[PDB]
Amino acid sequence: GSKIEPVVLPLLWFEQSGAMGGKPLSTFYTQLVLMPQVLHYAQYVLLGLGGLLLLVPIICQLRSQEKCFLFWS
């Protein structure tokens, strides 16, 4: 109905103060790029990159499991 329309206004306005101690995630991404808080996420990035990095040496392990000599230089 229309009765709750002016009611959500101050409610959002409190979110703008951070009165709920949180806002939608979309808003944070733009702060993260500049603010030290990104380092905590950088840890997560490092974990992901690290786990993905594991594939890299393994590829070479496979190149060694291929066993070649003629084209092996």
Swiss-Prot record:
Locations listed in the record: Cell membrane; Membrane, Caveola
Protein name: Scavenger receptor class B member 1
Lipid-conjugated positions (S-palmitoyl cysteine): 60
Coiled coil spans: none
Transmembrane segments annotated in the record for this chain: 39-59
SUBUNIT field: The C-terminal region binds to PDZK1.
Induction (UniProt): Both isoform 1 and isoform 2 are up-regulated in response to adrenocorticotropic hormone (ACTH).
Tissue expression summary: Expressed primarily in liver, ovary and adrenal gland, and, at lower levels in other non-placental steroidogenic tissues, including adipose tissue, mammary gland and testis (at protein level). Isoform 2 is expressed at lower levels than isoform 1 in liver, testis and adrenal gland. At the mRNA, but not at the protein level, isoform 2 is the predominant isoform in testis (80%).
Species of origin: Mus musculus
Full-length numbering of the shown residues: 405 to 475 of 509
Family under the similarity heading: Belongs to the CD36 family.
Post-translational modification note: N-glycosylated.
Domain of life: Eukaryota
Primary role: Receptor for different ligands such as phospholipids, cholesterol ester, lipoproteins, phosphatidylserine and apoptotic cells. Both isoform 1 and isoform 2 act as receptors for HDL, mediating selective uptake of cholesteryl ether and HDL-dependent cholesterol efflux. Also facilitates the flux of free and esterified cholesterol between the cell surface and apoB-containing lipoproteins and modified lipoproteins, although less efficiently than HDL. May be involved in the phagocytosis of apoptotic cells, via its phosphatidylserine binding activity.
